[PDB]
PDB file of C-alpha atoms and ligand atoms in Angstrom:
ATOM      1  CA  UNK A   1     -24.137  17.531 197.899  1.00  0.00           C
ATOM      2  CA  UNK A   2     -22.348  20.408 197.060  1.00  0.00           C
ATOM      3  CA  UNK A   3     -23.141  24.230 197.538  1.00  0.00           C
ATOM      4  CA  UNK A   4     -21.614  27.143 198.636  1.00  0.00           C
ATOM      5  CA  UNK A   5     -22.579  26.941 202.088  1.00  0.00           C
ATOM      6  CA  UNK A   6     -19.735  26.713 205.510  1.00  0.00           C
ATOM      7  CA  UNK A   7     -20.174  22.773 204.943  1.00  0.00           C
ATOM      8  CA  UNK A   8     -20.448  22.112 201.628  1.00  0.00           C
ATOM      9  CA  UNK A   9     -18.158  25.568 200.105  1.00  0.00           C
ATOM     10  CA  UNK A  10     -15.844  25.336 197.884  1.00  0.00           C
ATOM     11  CA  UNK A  11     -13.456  24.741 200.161  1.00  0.00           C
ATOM     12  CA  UNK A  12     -15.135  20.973 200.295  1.00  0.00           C
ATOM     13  CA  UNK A  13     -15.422  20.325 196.759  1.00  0.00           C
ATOM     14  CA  UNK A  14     -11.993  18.288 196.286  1.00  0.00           C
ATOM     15  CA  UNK A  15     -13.495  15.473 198.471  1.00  0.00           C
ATOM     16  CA  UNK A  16     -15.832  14.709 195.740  1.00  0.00           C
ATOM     17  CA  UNK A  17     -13.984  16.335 192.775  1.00  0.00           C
ATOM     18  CA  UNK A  18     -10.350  15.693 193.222  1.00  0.00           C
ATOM     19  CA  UNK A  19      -9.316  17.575 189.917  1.00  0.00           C
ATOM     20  CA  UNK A  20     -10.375  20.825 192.724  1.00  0.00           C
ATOM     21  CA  UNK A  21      -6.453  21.352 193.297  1.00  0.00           C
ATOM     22  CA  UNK A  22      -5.693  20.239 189.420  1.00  0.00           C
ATOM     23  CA  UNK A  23      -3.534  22.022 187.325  1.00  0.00           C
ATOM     24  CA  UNK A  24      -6.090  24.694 185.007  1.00  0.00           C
ATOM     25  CA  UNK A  25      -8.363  25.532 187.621  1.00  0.00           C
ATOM     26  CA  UNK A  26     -10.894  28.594 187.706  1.00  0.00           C
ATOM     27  CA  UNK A  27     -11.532  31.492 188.549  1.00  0.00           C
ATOM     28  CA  UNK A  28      -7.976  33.361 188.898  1.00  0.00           C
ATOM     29  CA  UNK A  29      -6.501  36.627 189.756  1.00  0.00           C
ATOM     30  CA  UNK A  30      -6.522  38.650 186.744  1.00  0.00           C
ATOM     31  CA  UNK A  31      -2.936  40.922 187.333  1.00  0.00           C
ATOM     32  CA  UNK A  32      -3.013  43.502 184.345  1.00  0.00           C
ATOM     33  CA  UNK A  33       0.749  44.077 184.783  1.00  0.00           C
ATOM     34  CA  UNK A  34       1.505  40.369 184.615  1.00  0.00           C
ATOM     35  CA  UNK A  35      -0.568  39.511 181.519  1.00  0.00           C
ATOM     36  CA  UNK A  36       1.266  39.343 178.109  1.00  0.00           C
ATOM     37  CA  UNK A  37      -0.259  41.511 175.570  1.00  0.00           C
ATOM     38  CA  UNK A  38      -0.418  38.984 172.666  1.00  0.00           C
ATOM     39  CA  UNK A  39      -0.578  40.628 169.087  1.00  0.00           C
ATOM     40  CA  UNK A  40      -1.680  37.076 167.758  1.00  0.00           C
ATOM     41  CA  UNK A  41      -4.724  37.478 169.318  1.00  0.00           C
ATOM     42  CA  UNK A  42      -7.559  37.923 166.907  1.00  0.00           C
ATOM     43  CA  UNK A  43     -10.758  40.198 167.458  1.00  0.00           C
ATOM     44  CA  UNK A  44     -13.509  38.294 168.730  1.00  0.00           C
ATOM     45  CA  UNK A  45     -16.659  37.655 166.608  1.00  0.00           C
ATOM     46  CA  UNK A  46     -20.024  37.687 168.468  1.00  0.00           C
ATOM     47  CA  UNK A  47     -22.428  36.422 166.010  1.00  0.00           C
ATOM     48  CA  UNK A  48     -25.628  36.013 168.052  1.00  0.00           C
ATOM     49  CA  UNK A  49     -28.424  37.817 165.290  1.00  0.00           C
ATOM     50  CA  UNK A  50     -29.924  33.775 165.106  1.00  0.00           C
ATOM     51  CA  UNK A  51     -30.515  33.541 168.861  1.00  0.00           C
ATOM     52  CA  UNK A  52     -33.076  31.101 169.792  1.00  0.00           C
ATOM     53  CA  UNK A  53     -34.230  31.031 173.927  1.00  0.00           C
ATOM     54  CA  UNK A  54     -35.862  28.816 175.234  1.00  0.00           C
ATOM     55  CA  UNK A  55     -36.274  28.639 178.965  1.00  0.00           C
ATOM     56  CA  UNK A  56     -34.834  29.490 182.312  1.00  0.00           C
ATOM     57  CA  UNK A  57     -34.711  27.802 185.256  1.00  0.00           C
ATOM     58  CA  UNK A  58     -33.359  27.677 188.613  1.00  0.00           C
ATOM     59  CA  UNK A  59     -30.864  24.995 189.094  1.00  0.00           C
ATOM     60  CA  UNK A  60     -30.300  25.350 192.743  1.00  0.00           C
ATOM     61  CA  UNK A  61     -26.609  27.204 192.522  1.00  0.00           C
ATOM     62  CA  UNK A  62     -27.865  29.845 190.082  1.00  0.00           C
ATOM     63  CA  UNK A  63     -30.161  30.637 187.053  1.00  0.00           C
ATOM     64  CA  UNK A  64     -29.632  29.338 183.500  1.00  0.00           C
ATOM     65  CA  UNK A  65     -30.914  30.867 180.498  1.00  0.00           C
ATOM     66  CA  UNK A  66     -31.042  27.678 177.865  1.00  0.00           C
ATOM     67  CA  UNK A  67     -30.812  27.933 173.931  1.00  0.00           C
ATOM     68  CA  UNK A  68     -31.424  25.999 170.799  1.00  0.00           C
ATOM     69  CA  UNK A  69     -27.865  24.650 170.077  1.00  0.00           C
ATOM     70  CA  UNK A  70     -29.449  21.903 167.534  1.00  0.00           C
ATOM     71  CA  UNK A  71     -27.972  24.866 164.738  1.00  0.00           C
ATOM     72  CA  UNK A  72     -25.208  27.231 164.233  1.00  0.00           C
ATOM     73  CA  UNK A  73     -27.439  29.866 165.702  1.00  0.00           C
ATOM     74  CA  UNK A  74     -25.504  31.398 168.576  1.00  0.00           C
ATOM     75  CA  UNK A  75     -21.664  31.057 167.940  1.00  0.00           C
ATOM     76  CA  UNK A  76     -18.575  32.454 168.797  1.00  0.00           C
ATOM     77  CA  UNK A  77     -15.368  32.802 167.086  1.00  0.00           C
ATOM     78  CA  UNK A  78     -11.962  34.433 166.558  1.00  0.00           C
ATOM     79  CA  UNK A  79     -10.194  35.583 169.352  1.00  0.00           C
ATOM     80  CA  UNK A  80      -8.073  32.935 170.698  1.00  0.00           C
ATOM     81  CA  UNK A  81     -10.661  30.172 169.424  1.00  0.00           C
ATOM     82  CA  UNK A  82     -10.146  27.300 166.506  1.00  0.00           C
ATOM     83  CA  UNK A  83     -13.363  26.423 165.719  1.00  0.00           C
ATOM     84  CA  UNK A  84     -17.191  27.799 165.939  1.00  0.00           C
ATOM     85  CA  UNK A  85     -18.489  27.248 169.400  1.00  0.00           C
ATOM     86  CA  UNK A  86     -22.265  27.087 170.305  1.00  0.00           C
ATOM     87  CA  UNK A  87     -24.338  28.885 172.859  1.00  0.00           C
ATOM     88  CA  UNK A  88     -25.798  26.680 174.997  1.00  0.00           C
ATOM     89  CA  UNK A  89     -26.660  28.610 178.143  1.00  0.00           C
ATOM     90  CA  UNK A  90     -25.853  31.683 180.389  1.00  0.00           C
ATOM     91  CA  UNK A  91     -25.644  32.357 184.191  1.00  0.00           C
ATOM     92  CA  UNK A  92     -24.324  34.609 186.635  1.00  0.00           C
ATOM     93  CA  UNK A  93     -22.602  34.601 190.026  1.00  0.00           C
ATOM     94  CA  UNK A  94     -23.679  37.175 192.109  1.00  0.00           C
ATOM     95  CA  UNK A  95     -22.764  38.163 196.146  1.00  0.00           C
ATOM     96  CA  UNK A  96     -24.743  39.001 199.248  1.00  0.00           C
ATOM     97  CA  UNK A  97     -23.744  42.993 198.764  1.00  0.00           C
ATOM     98  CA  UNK A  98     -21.973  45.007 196.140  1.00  0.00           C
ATOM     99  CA  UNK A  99     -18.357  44.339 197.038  1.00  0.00           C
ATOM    100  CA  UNK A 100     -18.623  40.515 196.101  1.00  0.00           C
ATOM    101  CA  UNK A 101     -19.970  38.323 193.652  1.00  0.00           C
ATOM    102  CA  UNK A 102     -17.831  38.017 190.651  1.00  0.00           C
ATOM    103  CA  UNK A 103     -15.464  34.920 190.482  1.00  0.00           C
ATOM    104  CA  UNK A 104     -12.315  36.335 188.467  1.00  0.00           C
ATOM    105  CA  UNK A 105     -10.882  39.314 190.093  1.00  0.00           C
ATOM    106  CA  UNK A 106      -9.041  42.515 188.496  1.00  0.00           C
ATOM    107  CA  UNK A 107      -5.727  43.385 190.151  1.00  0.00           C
ATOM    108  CA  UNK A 108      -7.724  41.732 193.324  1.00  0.00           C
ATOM    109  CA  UNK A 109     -10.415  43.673 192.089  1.00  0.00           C
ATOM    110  CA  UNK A 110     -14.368  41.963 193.166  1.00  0.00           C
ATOM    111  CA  UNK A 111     -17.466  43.073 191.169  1.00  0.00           C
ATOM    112  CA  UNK A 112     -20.802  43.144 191.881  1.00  0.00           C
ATOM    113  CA  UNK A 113     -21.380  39.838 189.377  1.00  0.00           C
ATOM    114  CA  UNK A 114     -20.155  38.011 186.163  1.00  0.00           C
ATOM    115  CA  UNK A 115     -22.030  36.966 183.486  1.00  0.00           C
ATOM    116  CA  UNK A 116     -20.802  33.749 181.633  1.00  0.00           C
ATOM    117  CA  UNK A 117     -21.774  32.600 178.216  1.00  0.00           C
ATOM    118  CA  UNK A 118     -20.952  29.299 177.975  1.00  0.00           C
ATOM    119  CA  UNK A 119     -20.297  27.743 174.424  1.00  0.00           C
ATOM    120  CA  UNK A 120     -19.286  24.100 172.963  1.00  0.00           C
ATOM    121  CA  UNK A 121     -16.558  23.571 170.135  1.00  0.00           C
ATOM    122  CA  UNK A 122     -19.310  21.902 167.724  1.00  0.00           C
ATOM    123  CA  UNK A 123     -16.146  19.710 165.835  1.00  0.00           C
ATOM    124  CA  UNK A 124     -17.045  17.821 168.904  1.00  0.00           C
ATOM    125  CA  UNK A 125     -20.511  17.554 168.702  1.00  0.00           C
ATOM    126  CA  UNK A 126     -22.639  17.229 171.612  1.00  0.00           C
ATOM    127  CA  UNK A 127     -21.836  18.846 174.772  1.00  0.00           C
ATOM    128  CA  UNK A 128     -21.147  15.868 176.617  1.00  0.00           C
ATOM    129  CA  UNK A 129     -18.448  15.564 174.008  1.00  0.00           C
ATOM    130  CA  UNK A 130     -17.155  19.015 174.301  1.00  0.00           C
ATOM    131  CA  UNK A 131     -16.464  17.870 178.319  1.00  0.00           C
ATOM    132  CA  UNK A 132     -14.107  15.568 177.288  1.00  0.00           C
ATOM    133  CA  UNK A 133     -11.707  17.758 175.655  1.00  0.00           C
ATOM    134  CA  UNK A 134      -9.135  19.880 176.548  1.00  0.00           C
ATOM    135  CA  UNK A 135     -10.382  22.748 173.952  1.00  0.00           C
ATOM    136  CA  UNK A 136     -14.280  21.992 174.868  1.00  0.00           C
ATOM    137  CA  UNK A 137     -15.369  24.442 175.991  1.00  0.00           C
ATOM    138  CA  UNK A 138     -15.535  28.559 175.793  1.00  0.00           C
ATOM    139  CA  UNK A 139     -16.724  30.881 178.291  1.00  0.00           C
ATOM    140  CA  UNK A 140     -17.097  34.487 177.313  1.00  0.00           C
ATOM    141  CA  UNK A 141     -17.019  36.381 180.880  1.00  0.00           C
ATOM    142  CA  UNK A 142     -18.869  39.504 182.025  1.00  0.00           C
ATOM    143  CA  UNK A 143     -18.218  41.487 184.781  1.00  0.00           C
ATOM    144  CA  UNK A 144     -21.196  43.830 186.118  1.00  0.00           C
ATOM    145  CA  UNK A 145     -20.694  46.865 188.299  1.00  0.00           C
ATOM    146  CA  UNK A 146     -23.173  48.606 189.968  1.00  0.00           C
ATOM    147  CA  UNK A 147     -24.476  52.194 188.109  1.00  0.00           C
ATOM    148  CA  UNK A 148     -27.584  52.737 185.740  1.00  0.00           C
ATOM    149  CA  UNK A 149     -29.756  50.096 184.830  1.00  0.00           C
ATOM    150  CA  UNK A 150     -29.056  47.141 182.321  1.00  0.00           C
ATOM    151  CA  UNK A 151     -32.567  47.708 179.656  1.00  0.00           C
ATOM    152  CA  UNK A 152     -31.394  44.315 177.944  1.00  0.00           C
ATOM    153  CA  UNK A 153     -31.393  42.517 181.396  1.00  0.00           C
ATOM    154  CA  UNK A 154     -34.857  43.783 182.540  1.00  0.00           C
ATOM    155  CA  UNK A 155     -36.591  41.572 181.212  1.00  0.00           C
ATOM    156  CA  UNK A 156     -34.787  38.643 182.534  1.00  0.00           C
ATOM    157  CA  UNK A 157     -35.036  40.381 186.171  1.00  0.00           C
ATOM    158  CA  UNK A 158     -38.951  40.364 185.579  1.00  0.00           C
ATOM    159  CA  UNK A 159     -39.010  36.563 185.447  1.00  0.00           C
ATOM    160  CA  UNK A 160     -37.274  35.519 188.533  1.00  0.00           C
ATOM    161  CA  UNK A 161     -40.480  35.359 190.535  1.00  0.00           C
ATOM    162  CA  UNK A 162     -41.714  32.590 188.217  1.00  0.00           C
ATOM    163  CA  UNK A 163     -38.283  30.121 189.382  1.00  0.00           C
ATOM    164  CA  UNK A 164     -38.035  31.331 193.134  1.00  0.00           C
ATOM    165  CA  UNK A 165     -37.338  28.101 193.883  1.00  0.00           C
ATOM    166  CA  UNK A 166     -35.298  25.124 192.729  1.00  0.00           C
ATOM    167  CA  UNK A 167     -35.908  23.194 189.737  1.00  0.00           C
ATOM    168  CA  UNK A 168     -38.473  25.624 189.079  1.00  0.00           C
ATOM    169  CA  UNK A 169     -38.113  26.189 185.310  1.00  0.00           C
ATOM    170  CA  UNK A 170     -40.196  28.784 182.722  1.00  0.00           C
ATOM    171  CA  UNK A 171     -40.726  29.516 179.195  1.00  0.00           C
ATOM    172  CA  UNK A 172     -38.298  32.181 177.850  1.00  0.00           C
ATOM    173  CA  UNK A 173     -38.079  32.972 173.988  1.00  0.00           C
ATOM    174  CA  UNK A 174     -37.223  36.108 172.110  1.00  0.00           C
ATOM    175  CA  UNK A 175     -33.956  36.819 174.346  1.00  0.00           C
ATOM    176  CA  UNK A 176     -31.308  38.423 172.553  1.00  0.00           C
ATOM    177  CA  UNK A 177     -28.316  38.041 174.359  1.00  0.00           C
ATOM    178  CA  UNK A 178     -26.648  40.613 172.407  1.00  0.00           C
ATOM    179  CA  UNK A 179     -28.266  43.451 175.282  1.00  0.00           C
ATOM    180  CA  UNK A 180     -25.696  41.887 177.472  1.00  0.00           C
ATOM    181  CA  UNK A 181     -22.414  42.837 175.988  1.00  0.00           C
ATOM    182  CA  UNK A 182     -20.367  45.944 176.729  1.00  0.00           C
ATOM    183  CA  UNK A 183     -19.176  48.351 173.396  1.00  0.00           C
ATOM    184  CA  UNK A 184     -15.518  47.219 173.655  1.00  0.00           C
ATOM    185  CA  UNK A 185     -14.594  43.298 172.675  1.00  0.00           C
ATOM    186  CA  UNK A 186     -11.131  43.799 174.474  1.00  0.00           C
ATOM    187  CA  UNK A 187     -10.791  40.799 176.974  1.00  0.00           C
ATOM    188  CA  UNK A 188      -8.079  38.691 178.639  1.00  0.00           C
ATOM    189  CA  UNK A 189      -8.062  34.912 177.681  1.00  0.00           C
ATOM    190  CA  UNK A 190      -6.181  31.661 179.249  1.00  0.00           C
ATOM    191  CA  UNK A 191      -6.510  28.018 180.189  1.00  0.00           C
ATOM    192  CA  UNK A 192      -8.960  26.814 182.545  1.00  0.00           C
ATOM    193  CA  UNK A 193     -11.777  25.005 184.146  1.00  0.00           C
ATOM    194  CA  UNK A 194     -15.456  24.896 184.785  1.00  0.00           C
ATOM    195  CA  UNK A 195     -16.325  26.533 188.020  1.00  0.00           C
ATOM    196  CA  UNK A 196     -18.822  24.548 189.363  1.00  0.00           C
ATOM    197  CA  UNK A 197     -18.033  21.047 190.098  1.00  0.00           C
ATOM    198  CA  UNK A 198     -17.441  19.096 188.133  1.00  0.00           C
ATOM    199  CA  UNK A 199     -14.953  21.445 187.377  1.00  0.00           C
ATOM    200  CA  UNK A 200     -13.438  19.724 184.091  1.00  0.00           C
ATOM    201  CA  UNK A 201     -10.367  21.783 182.758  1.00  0.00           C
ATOM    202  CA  UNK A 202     -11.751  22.023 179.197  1.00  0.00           C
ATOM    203  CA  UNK A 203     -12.111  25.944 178.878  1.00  0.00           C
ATOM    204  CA  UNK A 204     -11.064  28.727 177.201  1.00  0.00           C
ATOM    205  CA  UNK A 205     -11.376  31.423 179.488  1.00  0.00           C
ATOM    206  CA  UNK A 206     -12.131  34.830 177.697  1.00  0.00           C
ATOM    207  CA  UNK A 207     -12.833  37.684 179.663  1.00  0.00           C
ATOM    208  CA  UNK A 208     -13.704  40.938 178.504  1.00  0.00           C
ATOM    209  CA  UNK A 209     -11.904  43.975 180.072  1.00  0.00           C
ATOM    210  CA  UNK A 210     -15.037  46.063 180.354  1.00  0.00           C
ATOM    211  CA  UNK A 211     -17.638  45.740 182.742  1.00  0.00           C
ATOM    212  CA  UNK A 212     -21.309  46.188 182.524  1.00  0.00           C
ATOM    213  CA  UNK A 213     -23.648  48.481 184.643  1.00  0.00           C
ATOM    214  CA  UNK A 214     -26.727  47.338 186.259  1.00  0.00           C
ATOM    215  CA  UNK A 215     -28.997  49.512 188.953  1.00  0.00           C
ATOM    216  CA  UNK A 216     -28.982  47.930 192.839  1.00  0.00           C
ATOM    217  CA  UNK A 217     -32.546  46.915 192.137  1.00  0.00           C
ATOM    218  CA  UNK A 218     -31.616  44.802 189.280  1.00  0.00           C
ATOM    219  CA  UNK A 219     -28.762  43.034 191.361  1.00  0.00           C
ATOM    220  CA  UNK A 220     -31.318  43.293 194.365  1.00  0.00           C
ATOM    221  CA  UNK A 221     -34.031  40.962 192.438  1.00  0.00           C
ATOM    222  CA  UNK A 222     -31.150  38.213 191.750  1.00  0.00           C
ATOM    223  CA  UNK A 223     -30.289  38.021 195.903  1.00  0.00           C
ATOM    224  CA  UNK A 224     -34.258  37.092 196.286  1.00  0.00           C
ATOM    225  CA  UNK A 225     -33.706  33.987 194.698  1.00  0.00           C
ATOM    226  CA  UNK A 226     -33.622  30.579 196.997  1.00  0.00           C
ATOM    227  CA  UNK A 227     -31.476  27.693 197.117  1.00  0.00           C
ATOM    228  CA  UNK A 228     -33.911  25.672 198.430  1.00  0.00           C
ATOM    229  CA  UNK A 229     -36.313  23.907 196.477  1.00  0.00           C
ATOM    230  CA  UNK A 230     -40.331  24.759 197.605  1.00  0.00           C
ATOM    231  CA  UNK A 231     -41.773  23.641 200.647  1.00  0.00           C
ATOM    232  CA  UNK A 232     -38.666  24.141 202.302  1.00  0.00           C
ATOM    233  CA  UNK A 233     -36.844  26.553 204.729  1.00  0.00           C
ATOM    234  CA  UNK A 234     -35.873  29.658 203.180  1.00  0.00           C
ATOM    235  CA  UNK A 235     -31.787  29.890 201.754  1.00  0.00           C
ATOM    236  CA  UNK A 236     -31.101  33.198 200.002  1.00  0.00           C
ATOM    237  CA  UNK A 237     -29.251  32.384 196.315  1.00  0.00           C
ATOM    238  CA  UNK A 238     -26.175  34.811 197.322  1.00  0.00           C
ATOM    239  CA  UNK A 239     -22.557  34.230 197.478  1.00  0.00           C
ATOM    240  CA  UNK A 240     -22.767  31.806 194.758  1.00  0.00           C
ATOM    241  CA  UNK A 241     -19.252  32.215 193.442  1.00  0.00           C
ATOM    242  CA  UNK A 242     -15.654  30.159 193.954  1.00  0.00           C
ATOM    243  CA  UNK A 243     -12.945  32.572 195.243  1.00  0.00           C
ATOM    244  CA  UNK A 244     -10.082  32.683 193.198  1.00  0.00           C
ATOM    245  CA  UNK A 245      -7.743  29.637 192.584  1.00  0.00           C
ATOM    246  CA  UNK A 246      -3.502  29.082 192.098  1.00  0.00           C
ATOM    247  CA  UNK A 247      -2.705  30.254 188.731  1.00  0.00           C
ATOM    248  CA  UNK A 248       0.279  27.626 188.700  1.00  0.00           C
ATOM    249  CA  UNK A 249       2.393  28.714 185.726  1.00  0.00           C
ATOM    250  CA  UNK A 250      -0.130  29.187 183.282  1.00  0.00           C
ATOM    251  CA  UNK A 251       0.166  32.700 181.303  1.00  0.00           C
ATOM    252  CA  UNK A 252      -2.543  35.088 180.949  1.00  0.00           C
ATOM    253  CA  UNK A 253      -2.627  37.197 177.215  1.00  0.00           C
ATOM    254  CA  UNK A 254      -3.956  40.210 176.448  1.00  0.00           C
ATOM    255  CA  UNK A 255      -5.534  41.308 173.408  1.00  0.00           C
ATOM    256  CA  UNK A 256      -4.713  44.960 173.967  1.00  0.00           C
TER     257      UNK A 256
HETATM  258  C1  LIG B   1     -23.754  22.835 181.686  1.00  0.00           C
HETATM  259  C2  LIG B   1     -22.752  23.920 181.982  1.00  0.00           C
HETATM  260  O1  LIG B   1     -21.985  24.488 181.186  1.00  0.00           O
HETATM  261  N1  LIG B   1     -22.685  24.217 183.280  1.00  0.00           N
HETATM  262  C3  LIG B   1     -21.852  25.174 183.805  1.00  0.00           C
HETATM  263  N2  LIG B   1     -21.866  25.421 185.043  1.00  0.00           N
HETATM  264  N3  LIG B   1     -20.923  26.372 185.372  1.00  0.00           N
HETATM  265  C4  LIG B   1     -20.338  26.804 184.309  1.00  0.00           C
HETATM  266  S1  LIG B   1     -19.086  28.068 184.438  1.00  0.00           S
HETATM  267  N4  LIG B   1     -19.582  29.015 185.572  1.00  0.00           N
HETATM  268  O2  LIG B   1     -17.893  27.450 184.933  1.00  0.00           O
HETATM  269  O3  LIG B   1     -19.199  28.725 183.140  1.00  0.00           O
HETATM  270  S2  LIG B   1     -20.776  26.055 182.808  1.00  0.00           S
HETATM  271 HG1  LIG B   2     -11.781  18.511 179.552  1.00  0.00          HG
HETATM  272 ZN1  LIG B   3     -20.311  30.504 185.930  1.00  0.00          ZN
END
């Protein structure tokens, strides 16, 4: 199936997921002279004191960190959002060296990686609900630059021996997510999809306009991770991001 490699890229994934070359597709170009400054937009509100983790576990594309979305625990709010939406997970996309990696660009602009929080609009809910929607979904996205050292991402650094491989899978509790977020809540929002197939156009992109700093060894211990699952030849986890898609009309706001 489908991967980021020369034969099964995202440049292949429309065979399999025609909704590829849809309408609200993701990642885009994020132009800052372009984008509307919208003063409609709302603060955001980041209320993740109740944060329950659970595990983590190597999927095969990336690494999810899972939560307890059984409760109003994790949500997110305000902004350009109706609605609570639940934490469910997190993940990053990450490249091969420091110039690559993150899947929304800045003025053409590539970072290191991006963080993405993904919540569910609970008047839906389940999840699989949430997919079916055209206001499912919210991803809250994090771009990561390379500097001084992340303390609130050490410890999930520290674990990625344990899921080398894929489907590997470990116990992870007492993460607060909150060690992840920059000081300013200034982002860019607008209508898109899921990045990985596949690739439903149910979210609400928000992107936050500051990035986050993490050392080279922290990024470093992310590009050790494998594709493969054990037993098998060895595949670097790197590159595991979709270049930038056709904004087609759609407007991008600011909220500053
Ligand atoms: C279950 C779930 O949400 N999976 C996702 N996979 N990629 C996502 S992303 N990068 O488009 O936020 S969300
Ligand atoms: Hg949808
Ligand atoms: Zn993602």
């Amino acid at each position: 199936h489908w991967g980021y490699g020369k034969h099964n890229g995202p440049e292949h994934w429309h065979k399999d997921f025609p909704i590829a070359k849809g309408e609200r597709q993701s990642p885009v170009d994020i132009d800052t002279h372009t984008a509307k400054y919208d003063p409609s937009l709302k603060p955001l509100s980041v209320s993740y004191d109740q944060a329950t983790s659970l595990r983590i576990l190597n999927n095969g594309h990336a690494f999810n960190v899972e939560f307890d979305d059984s409760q109003d625990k994790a949500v997110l709010k305000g902004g350009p959002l109706d609605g609570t939406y639940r934490l469910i997970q997190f993940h990053f996309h990450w490249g091969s060296l420091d110039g690559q990696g993150s899947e929304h660009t800045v003025d053409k602009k590539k970072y290191a990686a991006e963080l993405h929080l993904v919540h569910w609009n609970t008047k839906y809910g389940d999840f699989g609900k949430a997919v079916q929607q055209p206001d499912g979904l919210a991803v809250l996205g994090i771009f990561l630059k390379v500097g001084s050292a992340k303390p609130g991402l050490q410890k999930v650094v520290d674990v990625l021996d344990s899921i080398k491989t894929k489907g590997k899978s470990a116990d992870f509790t007492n993460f607060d997510p909150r060690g992840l977020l920059p000081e300013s809540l200034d982002y860019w929002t607008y209508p898109g999809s899921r990045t990985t197939p596949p690739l439903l156009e149910c979210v609400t992109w928000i992107v936050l306009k500051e990035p986050i700093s993490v050392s080279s060894e922290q990024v470093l211990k992310f590009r050790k991770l494998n594709f493969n699952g054990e037993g098998e030849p060895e595949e670097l986890m790197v590159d595991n991001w979709r270049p930038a898609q056709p904004l087609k009309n759609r407007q991008i706001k600011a909220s500053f």
